[PDB]
């Protein structure tokens, strides 16, 4: 249940980002899951796929303030209440 | 005189010109934003 909240990049990379966060959920889908392992997976996948200097962040209540390259930023929400930010720098 | 008179000849090669031209690259630009995290 992906709910995109703020988009900056191109729709293809949008789709692949959603697919990768999904695959991360399945890699870690259990009460013992940690968002950190899925974060590692998201960032490393987007590195080996669309280049380095990616950054994955997952949570539900927090406050970031980061610098991002244009057309390389996404933030979104899940019906499962997972707010997921990703960005390249 | 004894060997009969010789015959002049001519040959020259093709000589390209030397030009001095200099060009530039530039450091690509970058962006720096800041955003907050929503509920």
Automatic annotation (TrEMBL), chain A:
GO biological process entries: microtubule-based process
Keywords from the UniProt entry: Cell projection, Cilium, Cytoplasm, Cytoskeleton, Dynein, Microtubule, Motor protein
One GO CC term, this protein: axoneme
Cellular location(s): Cytoplasm, Cytoskeleton, Cilium axoneme
GO molecular function, one term: dynein intermediate chain binding
Oligomer status and interactors: Consists of at least two heavy chains and a number of intermediate and light chains.
Recorded family membership: Belongs to the dynein light chain family.
Function: Force generating protein of respiratory cilia. Produces force towards the minus ends of microtubules. Dynein has ATPase activity.
Name of the featured protein: Dynein light chain
Organism this protein belongs to: Tetrahymena thermophila
Upper classification of the organism: Eukaryota, Sar, Alveolata, Ciliophora, Intramacronucleata
